[PDB]
């Protein structure tokens, strides 16, 4: 029996990247052919596994992480990357055994005048350790003066909103992302 990937791939709403979403799928068959030819993916890259040989993988669970970022940020969903998304929202380790699929979703995830559902973390103290989820909304202190939960100079709310319009260049348009993580 083949893996139930549509529930994650075809789901109507996707998580914001900072609060990325996690499905455990187990005891099934991951087949590269069926998966790749199911849609028009703009990125599909596997790490530590041979694409041809997904059927031959021997795993208890596959972990399906999904979320939305912008096109220019898709580069960062990969082992050993750096930047906003890879540092403060979603971090892949270097011993990464899985795949990373993505596709332009301007048609689902963009309204004229703006969709603001999708947020990203912009400031954090330490960098994210792989597969760690930070959904805290603590005011980020950039200076010596403490913030006391209030927002202002050197005291920034740590999440901002993509403003997803259809008008944007392809780099700033939304992309849906699924990360298969086998174990």
């Amino acid at each position, epitope marked *: 029996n083949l893996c139930p990937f549509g529930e994650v791939f075809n789901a109507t709403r996707f998580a914001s990247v900072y609060a990325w979403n996690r499905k455990r799928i187990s005891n099934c068959v991951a087949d590269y052919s069926v998966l790749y030819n199911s849609a028009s993916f703009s990125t599909f890259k596997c790490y530590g596994v041979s694409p041809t040989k997904l059927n031959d993988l021997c795993f208890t669970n596959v972990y399906a992480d999904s979320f939305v970022i912008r096109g220019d940020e898709v580069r960062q969903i990969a082992p050993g990357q750096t930047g906003k998304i890879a540092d403060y929202n979603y971090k892949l380790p270097d011993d990464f055994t899985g795949c990373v699929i993505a596709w332009n979703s301007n048609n689902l995830d963009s309204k004229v005048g703006g969709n603001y559902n999708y947020l990203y973390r912009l400031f954090r*103290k330490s960098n994210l350790k792989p597969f760690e989820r930070d959904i805290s909304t603590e005011i980020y*202190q*950039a*200076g*010596s*003066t*403490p913030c006391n939960g209030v927002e*202002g*100079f*050197n005291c920034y709310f740590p999440l901002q909103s993509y403003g997803f319009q259809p008008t944007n260049g392809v780099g700033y348009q939304p992309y849906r992302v699924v990360v298969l993580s086998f174990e």
Partner: single-chain antibody, 228 residues
Framework: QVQLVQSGAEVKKPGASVKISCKTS????????MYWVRQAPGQRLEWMGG????????SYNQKFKGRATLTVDKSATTAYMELSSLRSEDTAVYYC?????????????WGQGTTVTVSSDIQMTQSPSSLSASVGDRVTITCKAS??????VAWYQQKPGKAPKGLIY???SRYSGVPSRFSGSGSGTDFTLTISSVQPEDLATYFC?????????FGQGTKVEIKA
């Protein structure tokens, strides 16, 4: 090494404008906030405002808003401050200083300073205002804050004719390289600076500072004379 290098001295008629610069080197410029501190001739140190070079956001002291404008040029790693419509009250020395957060609180590096010559706030009180000691005495200087400031108090030392240099941040921690004879103390509203075996080179004026909220404020200064 960190270095803050300010533009040279300026002479301006009443009414003119002056844009004094502060060229940084030694560190990631966009990751440290920049403040401007005024020292009117024989007066308290005064925090004028600050700019965050990552975003270009500013906070000004109400006394200096609309007199002063703070900008940066990331491409030149340079902070700028423009004083408009100069009056004679504006003849002073202007310092740029770096917020050392989060490794060392408060202003951990100052510029040489630029002399410009024209022709509910948290109160900080120091005692004594003036002091005379002999090599080897301990000296004690206290600072009373008009409101609670936890341990967000720093002390600076201003040797004669130079910029302030940090000694203590966070009430009791020493800046990098500061001599161990300086120790700071206290909490809440009462702070003390102690110099333990005073050396001739300690001839300086010493200032406390709170950074518990904006605007930052300084004490009036404590002159320390060393008899030989």
């Amino acid at each position: 090494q960190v270095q803050l290098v300010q533009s040279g001295a300026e002479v301006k008629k009443p009414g003119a404008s002056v844009k004094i610069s502060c060229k940084t080197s030694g560190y990631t410029f966009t990751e440290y906030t920049m403040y401007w501190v005024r020292q009117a001739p024989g007066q308290r140190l005064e925090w004028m405002g600050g700019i965050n070079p990552n975003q270009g956001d500013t906070s000004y002291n109400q006394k200096f808003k609309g007199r002063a404008t703070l900008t940066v040029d990331k491409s030149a790693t340079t902070a700028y401050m423009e004083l408009s419509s100069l009056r004679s009250e504006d003849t002073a020395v202007y310092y740029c200083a770096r917020d050392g957060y989060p490794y060392y609180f408060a202003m951990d590096y100052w510029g040489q300073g630029t002399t410009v010559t024209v022709s509910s706030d948290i109160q900080m009180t120091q005692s004594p205002s003036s002091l005379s000691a002999s090599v080897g005495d301990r000296v004690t200087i206290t600072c009373k804050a008009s409101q609670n400031v936890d341990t967000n108090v720093a002390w600076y030392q201003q040797k004669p004719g130079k910029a302030p240099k940090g000694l203590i941040y966070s009430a009791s921690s020493r800046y990098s390289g500061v001599p161990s004879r300086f120790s700071g103390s206290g909490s809440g509203t009462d702070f003390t600076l102690t110099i333990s075996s005073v050396q001739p080179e300690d001839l300086a004026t010493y200032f406390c500072q709170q950074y518990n909220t904006y605007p930052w404020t300084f004490g009036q200064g404590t002159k320390v004379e060393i008899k030989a």
